Amino acid sequence: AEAWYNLGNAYYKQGDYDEAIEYYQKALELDPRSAEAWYNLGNAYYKQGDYDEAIEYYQKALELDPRSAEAWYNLGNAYYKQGDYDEAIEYYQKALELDPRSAEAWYNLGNAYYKQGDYDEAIEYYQKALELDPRSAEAWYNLGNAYYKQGDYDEAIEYYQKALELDPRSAEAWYNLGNAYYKQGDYDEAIEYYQKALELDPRSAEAWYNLGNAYYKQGDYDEAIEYYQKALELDPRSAEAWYNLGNAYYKQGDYDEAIEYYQKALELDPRS
Ligand SMILES: [Ba+2]
Ligand SMILES: [Ba+2]
Ligand SMILES: [Ba+2]
Ligand SMILES: [Ba+2]
Ligand SMILES: [Ba+2]
Ligand SMILES: [Ba+2]
Ligand SMILES: [Ba+2]
Ligand SMILES: [Ba+2]
C-alpha cells in the first residue's frame, strides 16, 4: 500500500491528477485505513476540477482522522468555490477551533462571511489577519472593501492607504480609493486617485466612467464628456452611460447632439 501512495504523490507534483487519482485509489484498495491518501485523493479532485467529488473523499479522511485541521480547511474551501457559505463558514471554524493560528483560514473565513451580505461580522475575521502579520497584501483591500460596503468610507480610505503602501501597483485599490472619495463627497480628491489607477490599467472602462462622473459633479462637462466617450469606445454596451453622456451634453446647452445619445441608450434598454 505504502508505495502506491508516494507514487500518486509525485504525479500530483507534475500537475497530473486523474493520473495521480488512479494510484491513490490503489493505495486505498490495499489499505483504506491511511487517511493521508483519502485526504490527497480529494486534493487531486480539488485540482482535476471536481469539487463535490473532493468533499466525499475529505469526509472519509475526517472519518478516520476527525481532527485533521488541514482537511476541515480544504473541505471548507471546496464548498466556498461551489459557493455555499452556510457550510464553508461552519467547516472553516471546525478548522480554527483546532488551529486558531491561521491568518490563511481567518482570511478565508471573511471571504465566506463577505457573501452573507454580512460585513459587520466579516471584518472581525479580517482583523484576525492583521494580528498574525501585515504580509498578506491582498487582505488589506478586502478590509477597506467591507468598510466601503457599510457606507463606512472614512475608515475604508485608511485601509487602502495601507493596501497601496504595500502594493502601489494594484489599480484595483487605486480605483476603489477614488470611489470612497466619491461618496464621502471629496471629488477632485477622487479624480486624482482614478488617474493613479488608469496609469496602471488604461483599458479599465469604469475608471474612465467614474473619473468622467467626478468632473460631472463639479459642473465641468468640457472634460467629463471627453472621458465618457473614452469609456464608450471601450464598451459601447452601456445604457445609463450613453445616458450620462447625453445628460452631460444637455448641460453644454447642446440638444441637437444630446438627443442622439439618449436614443443610443434607448436602443439597448428601451424599458427604462
Ligand atoms: Ba482530462
Ligand atoms: Ba473535470
Ligand atoms: Ba453540488
Ligand atoms: Ba457534480
Ligand atoms: Ba491534527
Ligand atoms: Ba468632507
Ligand atoms: Ba474643483
Ligand atoms: Ba478641493
How far is ligand 6, taken at its centre, from the CA of residue 234, in Å? 32
Say how many Å lie between the CA of residue 82 and the centre of ligand 3.
7
Q: Which of 37, 125, 108, 123 is nearest to 73 (CA)?
A: 108
Buried-state track 117-138, b at ≥16 Cβ within 10 A, e below 16: ebbeebbebbebbbeeeeebbe
Experimental method: X-ray
Distance of CA 175 from the midpoint of ligand 7 (Å): 19
Is the separation of the CB atoms in 46 and 38 below 8 Å? no
Cα–Cα distance for residue pair 206/225, rounded to 1 Å: 14
- CA end-to-end span of the chain, whole Å? 66
- 17, amino acid identity: Y
Specify the resolution in Å.
3.3
CA of 48 to the centre of ligand 2 (A): 5
Contacts of 63 (CB under 8 A, 6+ apart): 35, 38
Q: Which CATH number fits domain 212-272: 1.10.3720.10, 1.25.40.10, 1.20.1530.20, 3.40.50.720?
A: 1.25.40.10
* Cell numbers standing for residue 156: 475604508
